């Protein structure tokens, strides 16, 4: 309903869930799972 009212159905992702520093460490860990932070689902070094 929000998307139809506000033309915000498609939300382009500006940034990956992982930073440039955690990109490859996440690539190389099959158990690396995103966690919530400031309502955004991002990768953190805690789970790598």
């Amino acid at each position: 309903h929000n998307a139809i009212t506000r033309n915000t159905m498609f939300v382009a992702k500006d940034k990956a869930p992982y930073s440039d520093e955690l990109e490859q460490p996440v690539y190389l860990d099959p158990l690396a799972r995103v966690e919530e932070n400031k309502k955004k689902l991002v990768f953190s070094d805690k789970t790598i």
Binding site: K13, D14, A16, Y27, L28, D29
Partner: protein
């Protein structure tokens, strides 16, 4: 062809820009390596496969034994047209094919694809360890270059 994989990179706004997405072919978990994983060890998988094959052989023997009792059950449940010889022939072929499939699945679990579930075995390491080759055994890398 031991291994093969495809991958994408990440968010971006440059399609021709290459990325490190295929680095996931080397992914494994390294939180606690105090002891080697037994699954990477060839002889452990060999004895596991040997006991599984013994179980499958016992399964074949029990199935062929039960086939006589099942034929008698079908002898009354299929009328006088029942042929003992034909029933035994079809059902023995079925048992043999099932046993072949179990042997193949055991060899797939312990020889070929023992690294499907294990996150501590990367696709590359596990693909080589199927043939008992270590990471050091890749001698050449044909780069896109």
């Amino acid at each position: 062809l031991a291994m093969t994989a495809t991958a994408t990179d990440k968010i971006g706004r440059s399609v021709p820009a290459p990325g490190k997405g295929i680095l996931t072919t080397a992914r494994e978990h390294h939180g606690n390596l105090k002891y080697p994983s037994p699954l990477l060890n060839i002889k452990y998988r060999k004895r596991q496969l040997n006991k599984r094959l013994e179980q499958i052989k016992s399964w074949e023997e029990t199935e062929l034994s039960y086939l006589q009792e099942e034929a008698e059950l079908a002898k009354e449940e299929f009328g006088d047209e029942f042929s003992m010889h034909e029933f035994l022939k079809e059902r023995t072929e079925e048992v043999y094919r099932e046993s072949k499939r179990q042997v193949s699945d055991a060899k797939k679990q312990w020889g070929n694809s023992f690294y499907k579930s294990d996150p501590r075995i990367a696709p590359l390491r596990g693909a080589l360890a199927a043939f008992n080759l270590t990471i050091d055994d890749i001698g050449v890398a044909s780069f896109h270059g």
